[PDB]
Amino acid sequence: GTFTWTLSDSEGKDTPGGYCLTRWMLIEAELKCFGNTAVAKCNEKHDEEFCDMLRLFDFNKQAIQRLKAPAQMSIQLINKAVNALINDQLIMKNHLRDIMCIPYCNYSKYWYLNHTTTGRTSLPKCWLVSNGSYLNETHFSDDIEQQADNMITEMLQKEYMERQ
Amino acid sequence: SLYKGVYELQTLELNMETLNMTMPLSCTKNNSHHYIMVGNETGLELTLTNTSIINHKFCNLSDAHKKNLYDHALMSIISTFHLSIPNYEAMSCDFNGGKISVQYNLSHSNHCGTVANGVLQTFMRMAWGGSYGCGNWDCIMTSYQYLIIQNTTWEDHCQFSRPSPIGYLGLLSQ
Amino acid sequence: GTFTWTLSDSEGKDTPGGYCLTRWMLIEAELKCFGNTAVAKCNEKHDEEFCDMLRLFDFNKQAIQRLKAPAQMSIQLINKAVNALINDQLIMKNHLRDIMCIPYCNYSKYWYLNHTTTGRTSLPKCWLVSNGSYLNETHFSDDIEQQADNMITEMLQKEYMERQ
Amino acid sequence: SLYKGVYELQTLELNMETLNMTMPLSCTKNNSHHYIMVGNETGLELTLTNTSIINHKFCNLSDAHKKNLYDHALMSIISTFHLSIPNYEAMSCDFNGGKISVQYNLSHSNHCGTVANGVLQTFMRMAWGGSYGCGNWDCIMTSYQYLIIQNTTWEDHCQFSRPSPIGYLGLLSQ
Amino acid sequence: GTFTWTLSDSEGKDTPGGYCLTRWMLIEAELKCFGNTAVAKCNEKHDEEFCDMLRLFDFNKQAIQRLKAPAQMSIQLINKAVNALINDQLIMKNHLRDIMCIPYCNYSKYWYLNHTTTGRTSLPKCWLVSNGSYLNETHFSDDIEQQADNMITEMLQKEYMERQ
Amino acid sequence: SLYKGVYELQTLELNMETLNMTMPLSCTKNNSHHYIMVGNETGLELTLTNTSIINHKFCNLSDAHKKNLYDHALMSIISTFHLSIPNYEAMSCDFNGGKISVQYNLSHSNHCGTVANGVLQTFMRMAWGGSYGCGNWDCIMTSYQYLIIQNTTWEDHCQFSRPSPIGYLGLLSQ
Ligand SMILES: *[C@@H]1O[C@H](CO)[C@@H](O[C@@H]2O[C@H](CO)[C@@H](O[C@@H]3O[C@H](CO[C@H]4O[C@H](CO)[C@@H](O)[C@H](O)[C@@H]4O)[C@@H](O)[C@H](O[C@H]4O[C@H](CO)[C@@H](O)[C@H](O)[C@@H]4O)[C@@H]3O)[C@H](O)[C@H]2NC(C)=O)[C@H](O)[C@H]1NC(C)=O
Ligand SMILES: *[C@@H]1O[C@H](CO)[C@@H](O[C@@H]2O[C@H](CO)[C@@H](O[C@@H]3O[C@H](CO[C@H]4O[C@H](CO)[C@@H](O)[C@H](O)[C@@H]4O)[C@@H](O)[C@H](O[C@H]4O[C@H](CO)[C@@H](O)[C@H](O)[C@@H]4O)[C@@H]3O)[C@H](O)[C@H]2NC(C)=O)[C@H](O)[C@H]1NC(C)=O
Ligand SMILES: *[C@@H]1O[C@H](CO)[C@@H](O[C@@H]2O[C@H](CO)[C@@H](O[C@@H]3O[C@H](CO[C@H]4O[C@H](CO)[C@@H](O)[C@H](O)[C@@H]4O)[C@@H](O)[C@H](O[C@H]4O[C@H](CO)[C@@H](O)[C@H](O)[C@@H]4O)[C@@H]3O)[C@H](O)[C@H]2NC(C)=O)[C@H](O)[C@H]1NC(C)=O
Ligand SMILES: *[C@@H]1O[C@H](CO)[C@@H](O[C@@H]2O[C@H](CO)[C@@H](O[C@@H]3O[C@H](CO)[C@@H](O)[C@H](O)[C@@H]3O)[C@H](O)[C@H]2NC(C)=O)[C@H](O)[C@H]1NC(C)=O
Ligand SMILES: *[C@@H]1O[C@H](CO)[C@@H](O[C@@H]2O[C@H](CO)[C@@H](O[C@@H]3O[C@H](CO)[C@@H](O)[C@H](O)[C@@H]3O)[C@H](O)[C@H]2NC(C)=O)[C@H](O)[C@H]1NC(C)=O
Ligand SMILES: *[C@@H]1O[C@H](CO)[C@@H](O[C@@H]2O[C@H](CO)[C@@H](O[C@@H]3O[C@H](CO)[C@@H](O)[C@H](O)[C@@H]3O)[C@H](O)[C@H]2NC(C)=O)[C@H](O)[C@H]1NC(C)=O
Ligand SMILES: *[C@@H]1O[C@H](CO)[C@@H](O[C@@H]2O[C@H](CO)[C@@H](O)[C@H](O)[C@H]2NC(C)=O)[C@H](O)[C@H]1NC(C)=O
Ligand SMILES: *[C@@H]1O[C@H](CO)[C@@H](O[C@@H]2O[C@H](CO)[C@@H](O)[C@H](O)[C@H]2NC(C)=O)[C@H](O)[C@H]1NC(C)=O
Ligand SMILES: *[C@@H]1O[C@H](CO)[C@@H](O[C@@H]2O[C@H](CO)[C@@H](O)[C@H](O)[C@H]2NC(C)=O)[C@H](O)[C@H]1NC(C)=O
Ligand SMILES: *[C@@H]1O[C@H](CO)[C@@H](O[C@@H]2O[C@H](CO)[C@@H](O)[C@H](O)[C@H]2NC(C)=O)[C@H](O)[C@H]1NC(C)=O
Ligand SMILES: *[C@@H]1O[C@H](CO)[C@@H](O[C@@H]2O[C@H](CO)[C@@H](O)[C@H](O)[C@H]2NC(C)=O)[C@H](O)[C@H]1NC(C)=O
Ligand SMILES: *[C@@H]1O[C@H](CO)[C@@H](O[C@@H]2O[C@H](CO)[C@@H](O)[C@H](O)[C@H]2NC(C)=O)[C@H](O)[C@H]1NC(C)=O
Ligand SMILES: *[C@@H]1O[C@H](CO)[C@@H](O[C@@H]2O[C@H](CO)[C@@H](O)[C@H](O)[C@H]2NC(C)=O)[C@H](O)[C@H]1NC(C)=O
Ligand SMILES: *[C@@H]1O[C@H](CO)[C@@H](O[C@@H]2O[C@H](CO)[C@@H](O)[C@H](O)[C@H]2NC(C)=O)[C@H](O)[C@H]1NC(C)=O
Ligand SMILES: *[C@@H]1O[C@H](CO)[C@@H](O[C@@H]2O[C@H](CO)[C@@H](O)[C@H](O)[C@H]2NC(C)=O)[C@H](O)[C@H]1NC(C)=O
Ligand SMILES: *[C@@H]1O[C@H](CO)[C@@H](O[C@@H]2O[C@H](CO)[C@@H](O)[C@H](O)[C@H]2NC(C)=O)[C@H](O)[C@H]1NC(C)=O
Ligand SMILES: *[C@@H]1O[C@H](CO)[C@@H](O[C@@H]2O[C@H](CO)[C@@H](O)[C@H](O)[C@H]2NC(C)=O)[C@H](O)[C@H]1NC(C)=O
Ligand SMILES: *[C@@H]1O[C@H](CO)[C@@H](O[C@@H]2O[C@H](CO)[C@@H](O)[C@H](O)[C@H]2NC(C)=O)[C@H](O)[C@H]1NC(C)=O
């Protein structure tokens, strides 16, 4: 019950921890699961494209399972629900970046770091595009490394405080 | 590729098609065709042409619901597009039978400020695709004279893009 | 002056610390005060029903004390102020949960943990309802315990860093 | 009840009645009656009936402010309710004298898409109470033919609920 | 690349770290630069007037440099972009405070602490006004000191964890 | 001044004039004059007077764009102000030639609820300045009979204030 970003309050207790995306939810991929700590970051972050997409999937799951009603789109339901589920500022910033020919997120692919042998995952970040294609890791090599360092720092700080 | 010795860079790609049951998805084929899809059965094509389908100089939109309408979802989507456009009545509409369609007259005299642009801008906003000469978007124009909105069937319409709820949702946010 | 969630900047300096709710503000209860640390969490949290209610009371107090004007409702004032004071997303999520028959907050009662002999309080969370009644602590026992552990962790981390 | 040995679970309940001086509070009595209250003196009842109060086929709403209106707060609340409803003129209004009242005709031919539902949905939204068969809320209907909005006095109207600012505020947010 | 509050993703790599405001951006002042750590706070803070102003300047810079188009105001661009760049709640709270004759931020001057010999800076906070003039540091002496203590605490906590 | 021994209190002041190329700035001179400026060339004065400029009892606003309009930016700003005001047609407009101007008739019979107040309130909101008797802002009135909006040139208009984008942006947020 460490996830507040979700609509219902059940989701966390079912999977042992973390949050899983099944095969059907992914393109050309098998089941992937992210650590509880990283997923829980969406509870407070109010600036991440991944978290909003994650929330839409959670919503969709609930709508399908909860509404016994014929599965017609309830347009009224979406029009009502979107204000609660989506951060419109992210939508507009990516729209704005596209307008100004600045690399931006088009909500496709997400890139994350995975610490070898431990399977420790960062929360995924959006893989930016410009001029009809994706940007190379070379352009944003620096950001990739910043995330690696952020993960290292958390690991060490935890060890020190656990040791205390 | 290991960063700082131990962190592998790994990728994830989302399948947004699974969201088709609750929200419309926008997917494009090329600069002339954008497609909005509902569920696994229907949708509307948005297309740019130099020909017409409607010979009317008027839009019978309110009559489309006065008559029992053909699909609340589609009428809602069409209305949303129209409501977004700032107005001016440069629109003709048919809505006769199950085949529902609307046509906009993208006419102008300098084009800056016309509703024809309001239509073009909304059209592009509805389906970003990859949006590919970095000028201002504010007063733009295209070569096509007309915009057609028409019902269609569940086939193809996904090239240079994949279905995404973002277009529709973005307009709701506006 | 550790509270930024308030409208005026005076509120904290008056009571020794923390924030108090008088008898008149509570149902069938006497004065209750919460610790400064917990109250201050509302400065950054943007997802808590309790904090928005707390803010409305603070607003109300200021409107009554500040406006010398006949106490008519200024509808225009509320219509103007609400956008700043209330997180509409919380309102809509609880509305949505009700629609989908998912337990939700109806802004009534709030449940908190109190560490014995020290009086250390968590910030209160909303007590959910469904099908005309309140949910038992059994259904959300897990969340209650998560909060207890969160409080324990903070206590220990503080002791260790204070010791350093 | 001590969690982890030392944490007592303790409860708090808010008195929202103290907010009556600055914002309207919504409180219900049953499925036929919802009450909106102002200050410590007045308010409006919202009720579902199968009888009528207004014999008009028209609403003299603008005339209600043309004439010096009877209370800006109440006119504002009434207007807000009406503005929320998507439109269609299935409303009749009196507003003659201090007793102000409005009546909606909840008429329909399949009911999905009617303004009668827009009214029913807004009505319920305005006063959640405890909202108690998990179907879609989008196209719903009730047994009552009419909705009456009328001034009233400061008595009772709180059963299965307590006064709360949430209903009103939620509509402002929309 | 530690700044996410910006529109483009380049801004951080250019200046060695931190964020600089040139002479042209300041009134009666020469170049000033703030530390990276403090600036980065705007990535998560959703309640600070300084951060929104900072963002407008960043936007302006990009619009001028990126748009090759004649520099006419694109009103449509601003009307579109503002929703993403400005926290309207701050605008409304200051508006509300002014209405109620409560000291408020009018987005003019900002006050910060600077640790001597190290040049360590807090993120600036808005200097409030009321009744046609600025408030004295005496009225908000307490807040100034709270910030000084917050900086001290961070310094010490870092030293202890670095030592671990 | 060192706090806790080591922290100097230092100040920063922002120059918002550098933002003139992308967004309008509001700057005042006194209670009778508020000025909105664009780029480094033009702007609109907002002024409170007891005289008139327009002898019309009507506003030719739509004709202002029907005719090739004189500046999209200014027409947009004027429209925005007008749209903000809740309505009532107590407005006359000229827009003839490059000199564009509008005049509002701030007429009332008790003033509470008139559009004249809607205009006064928006006017003040547009340019806070320093806003300097703590009564409610809701139903206020001034001594001036008319509001004039008129094009002007790039001179002065900054006393007791400095240019700021906040006024305009605040109205967009509303
Ligand atoms: C975010 O931004 C990125 C970057 O622009 C977009 O990425 C593009 O995604 C599209 C769709 O996945 C790629 O387009 C093409 O997809 C074809 C698959 O569909 C075909 O077959 C079905 C039937 O099964 C038909 O219905 C359909 O009409 C098509 O005929 C591929 O076959 C295409 O292959 C061609 O290009 C590749 C190069 O990538 C060559 O190797 C092939 O030989 C062939 O010539 C093609 O892949 C498009 O390529 C992607 N671009 C890039 C740079 O990767 C994202 O779509 C966008 N948004 C989201 C939400 O993801
Ligand atoms: C959030 O959701 C919860 C759960 O549904 C709601 O909780 C309900 O709250 C109401 C109001 O407090 C409870 O309703 C009844 O209140 C009566 C008190 O008012 C009476 O007297 C006044 C005069 O003083 C009259 O004006 C008024 O009309 C009433 O006649 C009690 O007397 C009722 O008692 C009956 O039920 C209890 C069981 O609880 C029996 O023991 C009694 O003998 C008697 O039969 C009753 O309490 C309602 O019971 C609460 N429900 C639950 C499950 O607790 C919240 O109101 C809602 N929102 C907010 C903001 O709180
Ligand atoms: C936030 O709130 C604060 C507090 O109210 C406002 O601060 C005021 O700012 C204004 C403008 O900076 C100060 O007003 C006066 O500015 C004059 C400068 O402009 C003159 O010269 C130009 C040509 O160069 C002309 O175009 C223009 O019309 C003016 O003639 C000064 O000359 C004035 O000086 C007078 O007052 C001072 C006292 O401060 C005396 O010492 C002088 O001798 C003289 O009598 C004056 O400074 C105003 O004083 C400031 N008030 C306070 C309390 O500091 C902010 O503007 C507001 N918003 C923002 C965004 O900053
Ligand atoms: C629209 O989205 C739905 C998902 O929301 C897509 O349908 C899903 O298709 C997969 C693969 O066929 C089904 O997976 C398997 O289904 C069986 C039977 O239910 C189950 O026993 C397996 O364990 C597994 O889950 C999935 O259930 C099904 N979901 C639903 C709700 O039907 C649908 O194909 C999408 N439509 C379009 C046009 O893309
Ligand atoms: C609407 O809300 C107001 C509160 O905002 C309620 O009035 C309050 O009632 C309490 C109890 O009677 C008063 O408490 C005591 O008042 C005396 C005299 O002021 C004071 O000396 C005591 O120390 C104590 O505060 C409280 O002051 C009063 N507040 C106000 C502003 O009048 C009112 O009853 C509510 N109305 C309804 C219909 O519920
Ligand atoms: C409206 O804002 C622009 C800034 O966005 C103001 O123009 C700026 O004026 C300064 C001082 O004259 C220029 O600084 C210097 O310019 C030269 C030549 O470009 C350069 O070599 C120096 O290193 C330095 O940057 C600045 O470039 C110029 N910026 C632009 C975009 O023109 C303008 O004065 C403001 N208008 C009003 C009415 O206040
Ligand atoms: C991070 O790397 C580990 C190690 O490969 C991944 O764990 C494996 O995931 C695959 C997924 O198909 C399983 O088949 C393996 O059994 C897992 N264990 C190992 C040690 O291989 C982990 O999934 C990666 N993280 C993510 C989110 O993909
Ligand atoms: C987008 O694709 C469509 C479909 O292939 C192209 O339109 C077709 O053009 C041929 C040749 O003129 C006609 O026979 C088909 O009937 C047309 N199909 C449709 C659906 O109109 C269209 O020209 C392409 N546009 C761009 C910009 O590439
Ligand atoms: C869109 O849907 C309509 C029906 O909802 C289709 O119209 C049918 O068209 C066929 C072929 O001409 C007729 O035999 C049917 O009688 C029509 N039905 C009705 C009630 O309109 C239309 O063809 C579809 N359009 C596309 C492009 O798929
Ligand atoms: C639609 O028709 C118009 C009018 O013929 C086309 O616009 C002209 O195209 C010729 C080339 O064939 C150019 O030399 C002219 O300069 C164009 N006119 C203008 C005002 O630019 C237009 O290209 C046609 N559109 C499509 C999609 O075929
Ligand atoms: C947590 O528990 C302590 C201990 O009971 C509470 O402190 C008491 O509160 C009551 C309230 O009526 C006072 O009468 C007592 O004098 C307080 N002291 C003790 C030791 O009993 C504290 O209030 C509780 N926390 C909350 C928020 O209720
Ligand atoms: C809600 O309560 C009201 C008030 O008790 C009920 O309406 C009353 O019904 C009696 C008997 O027909 C009449 O004599 C009263 O005049 C009615 N009062 C009012 C205010 O209309 C109403 O039926 C109840 N509704 C539900 C769903 O329980
Ligand atoms: C609502 O308020 C109005 C007055 O604002 C009340 O109307 C009065 O009703 C009594 C009884 O019939 C008359 O004697 C008065 O002359 C009326 N005054 C005016 C000016 O209308 C009305 O009764 C109230 N309604 C309720 C249900 O309380
Ligand atoms: C209002 O009047 C209508 C019409 O008489 C009532 O609706 C019918 O009620 C009978 C039972 O008396 C049912 O058998 C019918 O099937 C109902 N009609 C429909 C279309 O469902 C309605 O119940 C009355 N409403 C109230 C609140 O008394
Ligand atoms: C905090 O204080 C230090 C020490 O004065 C400032 O660093 C100096 O800034 C001035 C700015 O003109 C430079 O000329 C000096 O060379 C800098 N070094 C020293 C040691 O004087 C620092 O800028 C201050 N912080 C801020 C944000 O103003
Ligand atoms: C605000 O300043 C203006 C400009 O000085 C004042 O209006 C001037 O008044 C003189 C004397 O009547 C006239 O000759 C000028 O033509 C007026 N100028 C303008 C632009 O109207 C105005 O009275 C001042 N208002 C306040 C409240 O101080
Ligand atoms: C505002 O701008 C207009 C032009 O855009 C100015 O109008 C001109 O005024 C002069 C002096 O009377 C005439 O010679 C020009 O022919 C006018 N041009 C047009 C096309 O209107 C007007 O004076 C400006 N107003 C202010 C106060 O600066
Ligand atoms: C505009 O004209 C009106 C009408 O003459 C002025 O209002 C009156 O001013 C006299 C003083 O000259 C007061 O004794 C009256 O009480 C005022 N009337 C009202 C209804 O209050 C008004 O002051 C003039 N406005 C300006 C800016 O000069």
Helices (DSSP H) in chain C: which residue ranges?
11-14, 36-39, 49-66, 75-85, 88-99, 141-163
Ligand with smallest separation from the Cα of D155: 2
Q: Calculate the CA D53 to chain-centre distance.
A: 18
Instruction: Provide the resolution (angstroms).
Output: 4.0
Nearest C-alpha in B relative to E82:
B174
Q: Calculate the CA F89 to chain-centre distance.
A: 19
| Chains F and B make contact, 3+ CB pairs within 8 Å | yes
Closest CA to C80 of F133, E115, F170, D132: F170
B42 Cβ inside 6 Å of ligand 4: no
Per the CB < 8 A criterion, the answer to whether F16 and F163 are in contact is yes
Partners of D47 in the beta sheet? Answer: D33, D148
Per the CB < 8 A criterion, the answer to whether C1 and E144 are in contact is no
Closest CA to D23 of B142, C85, A125: C85
C24 Cβ inside 6 Å of ligand 5: yes
Q: Calculate the CA C151 to chain-centre distance.
A: 17
Distance CA E27, CA C69 (A): 40
Report which protein residue has its CA nearest ligand 14's atom 23. Answer: D143
Distance CA D69, CA D98 (A): 9
Per the CB < 8 A criterion, the answer to whether F14 and E110 are in contact is yes
Question: Ligand 16, residues F27, F30, F31, F47: which to mutate, most atoms within 8 A of Cβ?
Answer: F30
Partners of D49 in the beta sheet? Answer: D146
Query: D148 CA to chain F: closest CA distance, Å?
Result: 25
Per the CB < 8 A criterion, the answer to whether A19 and A11 are in contact is yes
Distance CA C86, CA E96 (A): 14
Report which protein residue has its CA nearest ligand 5's atom 8. Answer: D18
| Chains F and A make contact, 3+ CB pairs within 8 Å | no
Which conformational region is residue E132 in: left (phi greater than 0), alpha (psi within -120 to 50 degrees), or beta? left
Q: Show the beta-strand stretches assigned E in chain F.
A: 2-3, 7-13, 25-30, 33-38, 42-49, 91-93, 101-105, 146-153
Query: Per-residue b/e over D49-79, b at no fewer than 16 CB within 10 Å?
Result: eeeeebeeeebebeebbeeebbbbbbbbbbe
Sign of CA dihedral A118, A122, A124, A126: negative
Per the CB < 8 A criterion, the answer to whether B168 and B126 are in contact is yes
Phi, psi torsion values for B147, nearest 5 degrees = -110, 125
What is the 8-class DSSP label of residue C124?
P
Which residues from chain F sit within 8 angstroms of residue E74, using beta carbons?
Answer: 22
Ligand with smallest separation from the Cα of D146: 14
Closest CA to C131 of C97, C91, C88: C97
Which residues from chain A sit within 8 angstroms of residue D84, using beta carbons?
Answer: none
- Decide if C69 and F135 are in contact by the 8 Å CB cutoff: yes
Any E CB within 8 A of A160 CB: yes
Closest CA to E29 of E142, E100, E135, E110: E110
Phi, psi torsion values for A21, nearest 5 degrees = -115, 115
- Decide if B135 and E68 are in contact by the 8 Å CB cutoff: yes
Per the CB < 8 A criterion, the answer to whether B22 and A56 are in contact is no
Distance CA A97, CA E39 (A): 22
Residue B45, helix vs strand vs coil: strand
Question: Ligand 9, residues B68, B69, B99, B150: which to mutate, most atoms within 8 A of Cβ?
Answer: B99
Longest CA–CA separation in chain B, Å: 68
Pocket around ligand 3 at a 6 A CB cut-off: E 106-108, 129, 132-134; F 130, 156, 158-162, 164
Per the CB < 8 A criterion, the answer to whether F174 and F84 are in contact is yes
- Decide if F69 and B110 are in contact by the 8 Å CB cutoff: no
Distance CA A48, CA C18 (A): 32
Which residues from chain A sit within 8 angstroms of residue D138, using beta carbons?
Answer: 74-77
Per the CB < 8 A criterion, the answer to whether F1 and E137 are in contact is yes
Question: Ligand 13, residues D74, D78, D99: which to mutate, most atoms within 8 A of Cβ?
Answer: D99
Torsion of CA F52, F58, F60, F61, to 10 degrees: 80
H or E stretch including E114?
A: strand E109-115
Distance CA D167, CA D81 (A): 11
Phi, psi torsion values for D134, nearest 5 degrees = 60, 35
Distance CA C82, CA D166 (A): 11
Closest CA to C95 of D119, D169, A70: D169
CA-based angle F134:C54:E143, to the nearest 5? 70
Residue C83, helix vs strand vs coil: helix
| Long-range contacts of residues B119-123, Cβ cutoff 8 Å, at least 24 apart | B119/B85, B119/B147, B120/B147, B122/B81, B122/B84, B122/B85, B122/B171, B123/B34, B123/B46, B123/B48, B123/B147
B vs F: CB pairs below 8 A = 5
Experimental approach was cryo-EM
Query: F55 CA to chain E: closest CA distance, Å?
Result: 31
H or E stretch including B156?
A: none
Helices (DSSP H) in chain A: which residue ranges?
11-14, 36-39, 49-66, 75-85, 88-99, 141-163
Which conformational region is residue B134 in: left (phi greater than 0), alpha (psi within -120 to 50 degrees), or beta? left
